[PDB]
Symmetry: T
Subunit: 136 residues, 12 copies
Amino acid sequence: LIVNVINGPNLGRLGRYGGTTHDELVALIEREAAELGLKAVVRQSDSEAQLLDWIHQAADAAEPVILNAGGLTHTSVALRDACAELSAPLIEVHISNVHAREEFRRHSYLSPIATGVIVGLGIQGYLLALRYLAEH
Amino acid sequence: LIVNVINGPNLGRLGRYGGTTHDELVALIEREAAELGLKAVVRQSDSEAQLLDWIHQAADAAEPVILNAGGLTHTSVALRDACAELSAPLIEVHISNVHAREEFRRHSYLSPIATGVIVGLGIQGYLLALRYLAEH
Amino acid sequence: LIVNVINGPNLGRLGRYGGTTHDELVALIEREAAELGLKAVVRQSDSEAQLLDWIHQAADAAEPVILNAGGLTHTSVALRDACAELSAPLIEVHISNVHAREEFRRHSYLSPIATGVIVGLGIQGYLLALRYLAEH
Amino acid sequence: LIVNVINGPNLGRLGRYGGTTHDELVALIEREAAELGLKAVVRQSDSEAQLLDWIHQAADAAEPVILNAGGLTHTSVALRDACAELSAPLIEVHISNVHAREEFRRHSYLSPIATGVIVGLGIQGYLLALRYLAEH
Amino acid sequence: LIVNVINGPNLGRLGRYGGTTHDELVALIEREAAELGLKAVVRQSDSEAQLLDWIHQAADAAEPVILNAGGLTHTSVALRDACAELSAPLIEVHISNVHAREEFRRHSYLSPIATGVIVGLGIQGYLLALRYLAEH
Amino acid sequence: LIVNVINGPNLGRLGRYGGTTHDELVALIEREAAELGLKAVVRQSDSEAQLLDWIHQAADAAEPVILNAGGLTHTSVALRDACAELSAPLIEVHISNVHAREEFRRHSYLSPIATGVIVGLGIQGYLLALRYLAEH
Amino acid sequence: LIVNVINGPNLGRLGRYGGTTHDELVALIEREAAELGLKAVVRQSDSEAQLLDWIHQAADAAEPVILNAGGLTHTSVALRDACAELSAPLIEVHISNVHAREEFRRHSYLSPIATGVIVGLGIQGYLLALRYLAEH
Amino acid sequence: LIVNVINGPNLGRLGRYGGTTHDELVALIEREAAELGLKAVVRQSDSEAQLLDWIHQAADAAEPVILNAGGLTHTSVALRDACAELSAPLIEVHISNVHAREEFRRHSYLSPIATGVIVGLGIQGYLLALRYLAEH
Amino acid sequence: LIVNVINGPNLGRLGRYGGTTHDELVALIEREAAELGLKAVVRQSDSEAQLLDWIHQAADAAEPVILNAGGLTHTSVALRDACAELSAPLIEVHISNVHAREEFRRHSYLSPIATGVIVGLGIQGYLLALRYLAEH
Amino acid sequence: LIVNVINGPNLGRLGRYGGTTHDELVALIEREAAELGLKAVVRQSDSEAQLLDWIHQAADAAEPVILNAGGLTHTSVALRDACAELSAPLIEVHISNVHAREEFRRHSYLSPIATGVIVGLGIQGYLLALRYLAEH
Amino acid sequence: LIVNVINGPNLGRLGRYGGTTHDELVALIEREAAELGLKAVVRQSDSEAQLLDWIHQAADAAEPVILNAGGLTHTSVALRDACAELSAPLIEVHISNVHAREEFRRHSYLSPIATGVIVGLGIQGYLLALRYLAEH
Amino acid sequence: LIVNVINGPNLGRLGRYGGTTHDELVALIEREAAELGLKAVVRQSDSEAQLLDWIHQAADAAEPVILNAGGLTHTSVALRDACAELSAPLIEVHISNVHAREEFRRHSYLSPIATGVIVGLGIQGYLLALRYLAEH
Ligand SMILES: O=C(O)[C@]1(O)C=C([C@H](O)Cc2ccccc2)[C@@H](O)[C@H](O)C1
Ligand SMILES: O=C(O)[C@]1(O)C=C([C@H](O)Cc2ccccc2)[C@@H](O)[C@H](O)C1
Ligand SMILES: O=C(O)[C@]1(O)C=C([C@H](O)Cc2ccccc2)[C@@H](O)[C@H](O)C1
Ligand SMILES: O=C(O)[C@]1(O)C=C([C@H](O)Cc2ccccc2)[C@@H](O)[C@H](O)C1
Ligand SMILES: O=C(O)[C@]1(O)C=C([C@H](O)Cc2ccccc2)[C@@H](O)[C@H](O)C1
Ligand SMILES: O=C(O)[C@]1(O)C=C([C@H](O)Cc2ccccc2)[C@@H](O)[C@H](O)C1
Ligand SMILES: O=C(O)[C@]1(O)C=C([C@H](O)Cc2ccccc2)[C@@H](O)[C@H](O)C1
Ligand SMILES: O=C(O)[C@]1(O)C=C([C@H](O)Cc2ccccc2)[C@@H](O)[C@H](O)C1
Ligand SMILES: O=C(O)[C@]1(O)C=C([C@H](O)Cc2ccccc2)[C@@H](O)[C@H](O)C1
Ligand SMILES: O=C(O)[C@]1(O)C=C([C@H](O)Cc2ccccc2)[C@@H](O)[C@H](O)C1
Ligand SMILES: O=C(O)[C@]1(O)C=C([C@H](O)Cc2ccccc2)[C@@H](O)[C@H](O)C1
Ligand SMILES: O=C(O)[C@]1(O)C=C([C@H](O)Cc2ccccc2)[C@@H](O)[C@H](O)C1
Ligand SMILES: [Cl-]
Ligand SMILES: [Cl-]
Ligand SMILES: [Cl-]
Ligand SMILES: [Cl-]
Ligand SMILES: [Cl-]
Ligand SMILES: [Cl-]
Ligand SMILES: [Cl-]
Ligand SMILES: [Cl-]
Ligand SMILES: [Cl-]
Ligand SMILES: [Cl-]
Ligand SMILES: [Cl-]
Ligand SMILES: [Cl-]
Ligand code: NA
Ligand code: NA
Ligand code: NA
Ligand code: NA
Ligand code: NA
Ligand code: NA
Ligand code: NA
Ligand code: NA
Ligand code: NA
Ligand code: NA
Ligand code: NA
Ligand code: NA
Ligand code: NA
Ligand code: NA
Ligand code: NA
Ligand code: NA
Ligand code: NA
Ligand code: NA
Ligand code: NA
Ligand code: NA
Ligand code: NA
Ligand code: NA
Ligand code: NA
Ligand code: NA
Ligand code: NA
Ligand code: NA
Ligand code: NA
Ligand code: NA
Ligand code: NA
Ligand code: NA
Ligand code: NA
Ligand code: NA
Ligand code: NA
Ligand code: NA
Ligand code: NA
Ligand code: NA
């Protein structure tokens, strides 16, 4: 029933990844979750510690997480280790196709511990992740 | 309207990636495509040349492709170059989480030229790809 | 009782790896298998898909395989994944000593999933593999 | 007198490497070979096994080969080993400048066993290879 | 007629590579060599210098060697250089499949200078090596 | 009409790459250029600065260059940057097959900025380059 | 007119990079900016999120940034992506010569997206950056 | 007399590294420090900036630090540079054996600047570090 | 009760790692073990085979080992494989901080199979290891 | 008082790095040096030996050098070793941002021995270097 | 006056590095040392521990060492660390040109701690080392 | 009888590698060569082309060369290829121990084609090379 959507650094700047703003994204996700009979809790922080605290709470609550970690995807072992604690599914989401850009973006610390990964499908990636979780 | 789902080597062995057989997968995909108002053409070959011919035809027809290339994902430049010709969207799909296994599976020749990539969501990955294409 | 000997690309050219022709090799293997009280089914193809189909059938039949994949040894993830399905033993055979040539020949995708590997013992390698299987 | 021109995967799509179609290329090559007093046999396949069979026949016939292997250039040890059997000259041809694109295209399994290599001169590359062979 | 079987570090601990003890292995090898009409001299040391001395003596005597060097396989240039002096055949044997474990075990200093290599066939590997030498 | 043929270090030693001397090469190139209706200006220096000055002048004159840079092929960023200024075609030529020798010769700083590359066709490589330029 | 000088982790410890304190640095920068007819806004944080927020505000305001990111220079993709949004110039500044120390300090995620980089000129580096911006 | 024990990201989750909670760990450390005649100040944060501030204060106070940085061990140059300022001893502690897990955990930015490192001894690692400092 | 302290090559030279001699170290260790209610058996050899024999005996006796292997730490697969047999705890000890010196010293073949590792705490490292074992 | 500005290969082509010609650059530098109360001696050569001779003379005279070595930046150990002799400051200058182009341009042999480095600030880089030296 | 010449594994096999036997080498070295007014003590062992003991004794005696370590050159950190203790000069000698063979022979653990290195000058290398030491 | 001693870039600066000047070195070498009954021709240039010309002349004259190429040792394929033409012996000499400094100095393009190499023995290295050549 409850799903956590957690966005990391710079994702608050979506729109200004253009068109949709983060506020719009939250509204889309919430609308879509309601139709699926889920409740989406969508949060964004540029702070790794804040991110880690949200993940810790999903781990304690055994709630699933859809995570778009931004740059921390490629850099943060700490974030990986927090997510490795999740017992419910973890879907890694990237808006952009991370394999079509700089080589360094083709490595994720999260993918190996995620249930699955969706990249390059834009913001619909989040909606598709919600739908996976509604079937699982 | 028409979407090509193309599965590469070993994908004919799904079930015996267990539970669902390839015949079941075809039926699921077709059922789901019909609901979305699409027509899914689902094919599987262990032959790279056969794969290439299907991709060539999608390129000529400007039809979208959902491709799960199996091992060729990690090895075939030829397949990449055929897919690079597609003008409609190309969604790379892996059933398994390719980042949770051998290191060599973490590189795809296809990802950089794909619209996007879905891994580790099982066969629902294909359904989710269909839904992306129904919105695009 | 039944053992599959599968030879991959270029192995049909043995003799023209000189002296023994592939037809001779088949006759040697069959003669030796009969003495061991086995039946050897020996096949060769330059087609990866044909190879994969033979491996699929050995997997379904739970028959052991002696495989000399030729160049695909060093390149084919698809072949590896088909062989990874075998429940009976898989003996990788190379006629030449692959460690005494180009560096790229020193990596095999097959070895990690094989029961064992025999290289550099010429065609007797196949006979020795048959003898292993006759004890196991 | 007889020269084999062998084109690998995707080369059948030339034109749709734009302008000249493969049929046009065949006609150019044949016209040019006739002027040189050679007979050009020009073939294309997306199938590696078909390619290998053509190379095997050039090896048996001691005929020279001009080979544009497409993506297999960068991936196929099997193809290399077939070509390594050729006793007549082997000219590797690429239409595009393979050194001006992705890093992975800068490695060829064929170059070390080829007589020589022509890249980036477009389809005239094939004509220039024919002319080399007419002097050798 | 005479064949040297030389086992390196830790191979004296076989059994405690379980089931068969080194004493058992010696008895198996000797029994099998007698049937083949050979005399097997089987020795084991954890000392590299002792190993080197045995190899030096096989080189002086032009006797073949079956060598399972244990960890030194992956580390000892000195051992390689002693074995490179052997004029009779050198068969490298590993009980375990060295390609199915840690990456560092996939490199052998010995393979490039060995006649051939047998891995992963258990102690039967030694018997199979003896049989090769009985045909050569 | 005017084409610059520029040879770098050690190419003055051709003959003593044996048979043809550099003087012979110049005469062959000039003879062949005349037949093609071109004027070939052929120069050789062991001095990088001299080379750079010739390239600068071809850049100012918008004249094409056939360049065999010798060892500088593999080492000189300065030479690359001078050649990157050429607006007319740049054909990189190597007499020897640089892919059949030391690994370090398989990298060229020039190839990525050249129109194309001809290697391993001996001195005919230069003639073939002239012919390309006569068609372009 | 307005220029942002942003210092990252540990830069608050300057002096205790010795002699000048961060307070002194701020006073130098402000004095120098006034002479140039600019207004310098100088901030320091050990918090990446705080840094990111400052960069976001410079991006919204189209103000130039002089950034000395400290260790995050070498580690933070998130910081890079925030800076990649800046439309005004971005000058990366390091007090120390990062190429004269540990190898890991020779890579910057920022340099490729910066207008330019000044290292090893001490705190005068900041003054020199201000002067660049006063001319641009 | 005073020793700082600083724990980084995720270490607040110890117990839920299982059995002992962080509160228990603090009590153990304090009990043990008292017996040694030291005062242990034990702190934990998921925030790098908070960590850096604690390290800065130990540097100003010339107090020793026992640091278990969690994932930042493997990623944070900023943390390293703060710790490099410590004039009193710095003992790096890991509860788990970081060399028995993923390859990326086998590199620490901290070790080269630490006095020493204790890994894999569980929470007793902290007690053992305290005892080192009580002798130094 | 019984603990084996095993020192490898060059450790007999401690003092001439200065101050304490190996004889002193033995006396310290023995004194400390007695206080802990253990018996320490402390041995040193420059011979790998001797080392291996001691490890074999600890494995047979299920006694714990504190091992400072010296240079063999970084080189000996054989030693690793002997230690991998230990069923009681194995504590790797280095006197010096191996991460503050040459890069090659930052890899240990032993760490992945050790219970834990203590480096850079001088000879107190051994005492601290004894204390760990007295609690386990 | 006297400062040497030394430009390496291809820098004589500035303008035809566009807009400003090398003659203009010399005039700018001289004008700016005069204002600073310095005398700038500005030289350019495509010859490494000429460069080395200028550096040798600055070393003998203990004069500072601003060096833009062009491609030799990335290739010349000889140049580095000459510059390593300079006792006065050495400022490495690049007009372009060398970190925003080909990977090979991100390594400089000069940076580790330079006082500092300015890249990507265009020709103002030279003026800014002069100003550094006027303060030092 | 006294110089130690120490030869490592396989060097006892010189002659059977052909022509001169080790006994001959000893006689040459002794003859040459006498002429130089030195006393040469020449020893050879295939045992690393024996080697280490000889080096330890040269360190205690502050005697110079000429060392040809054979394969251990490329493998033994232990040997390096013993030699690093020598206060008198250490000349590394190789009979063969180690840079003209396998890539792995181009790395020596000894060179960085040696006074100097002579390779490829055959046994005269030892005589030349003696002469260096007679001048130093 | 005649031996060429060729010194490359920066070697003209010896003394200002301190103590002995290049003029002194020439006098030492000449004095020593005369005693050996040789004639030493000693030359130095900072110009690669000049170096190449000297090597070409030694190749034509079949005279031996002692070469200290300075930085070009590590960078110049052109120089290597000129030296590869020498039919008489080529001794590579370095004054400094190139293995005790920066990693990049541990690779020589010359060593693989040299007869032998002497490093780290100072200027006596040249004298020792002369003595080798006087015996060969
Ligand atoms: O495609 C993604 O969703 C991705 O996770 C996001 C980012 C950054 O947040 C990029 C970014 C930059 C500016 C505004 C919003 C997002 C990148 O750091 C990642 O590489 C990929
Ligand atoms: O997860 C996937 O969908 C993937 O594309 C599939 C394969 C292989 O087909 C694995 C396989 C093996 C046996 C039967 C069916 C599929 C693997 O080669 C790829 O690495 C990943
Ligand atoms: O030694 C082998 O058996 C091996 O599997 C075979 C090949 C190729 O088939 C080589 C080859 C080439 C020509 C004719 C027959 C075989 C090589 O591709 C492999 O590296 C090694
Ligand atoms: O330039 C070439 O001739 C080359 O051999 C060809 C290809 C592919 O065939 C590219 C391709 C793609 C689509 C249609 C035709 C050709 C690429 O795979 C190779 O990297 C280079
Ligand atoms: O499989 C083998 O035969 C192999 O040569 C043996 C070893 C070691 O001896 C492993 C070992 C460990 C304990 C007892 C006996 C053998 C390993 O060092 C090698 O990697 C592989
Ligand atoms: O094949 C070539 O044309 C090539 O450019 C030439 C050289 C050198 O000039 C080799 C050489 C050596 C001696 C005389 C003439 C040429 C090599 O440096 C390059 O690797 C290849
Ligand atoms: O030279 C710089 O300005 C640099 O950005 C700064 C740092 C750190 O902040 C180093 C540091 C450490 C302690 C106090 C102040 C600064 C290093 O992390 C970077 O590698 C280089
Ligand atoms: O073993 C350690 O103490 C280590 O420092 C800790 C971590 C993480 O904090 C792991 C972690 C994960 C969840 C809860 C607590 C700790 C890992 O990031 C490090 O690799 C090793
Ligand atoms: O710090 C250690 O205890 C270490 O195990 C020891 C050594 C060597 O034994 C160094 C040495 C050298 C001379 C005398 C005693 C010890 C080094 O080989 C290892 O890298 C580290
Ligand atoms: O940006 C620079 O100043 C740099 O030093 C210069 C060059 C070359 O000289 C590029 C060049 C090319 C053509 C004309 C002038 C300059 C490049 O070789 C370097 O990578 C960077
Ligand atoms: O050239 C040398 O002197 C060298 O030290 C010696 C060896 C070995 O001892 C080679 C060897 C092999 C057989 C008999 C004698 C020597 C090789 O291990 C080294 O790579 C080089
Ligand atoms: O030790 C040598 O003889 C060496 O060949 C010389 C140099 C340079 O010439 C170093 C140098 C620098 C200044 C004056 C003289 C020599 C270095 O470039 C090489 O790495 C080593
Ligand atoms: Cl990972
Ligand atoms: Cl790719
Ligand atoms: Cl693998
Ligand atoms: Cl290759
Ligand atoms: Cl090897
Ligand atoms: Cl390049
Ligand atoms: Cl980058
Ligand atoms: Cl580090
Ligand atoms: Cl390991
Ligand atoms: Cl460098
Ligand atoms: Cl080293
Ligand atoms: Cl080389
Ligand atoms: Na929630
Ligand atoms: Na999990
Ligand atoms: Na979308
Ligand atoms: Na279709
Ligand atoms: Na496309
Ligand atoms: Na599913
Ligand atoms: Na069958
Ligand atoms: Na299996
Ligand atoms: Na055989
Ligand atoms: Na034909
Ligand atoms: Na051939
Ligand atoms: Na063309
Ligand atoms: Na014997
Ligand atoms: Na041999
Ligand atoms: Na067995
Ligand atoms: Na001209
Ligand atoms: Na151009
Ligand atoms: Na030719
Ligand atoms: Na502002
Ligand atoms: Na920007
Ligand atoms: Na300053
Ligand atoms: Na405190
Ligand atoms: Na410190
Ligand atoms: Na514990
Ligand atoms: Na004991
Ligand atoms: Na164990
Ligand atoms: Na201590
Ligand atoms: Na001057
Ligand atoms: Na200097
Ligand atoms: Na400018
Ligand atoms: Na002695
Ligand atoms: Na020393
Ligand atoms: Na000699
Ligand atoms: Na001469
Ligand atoms: Na030669
Ligand atoms: Na000297």
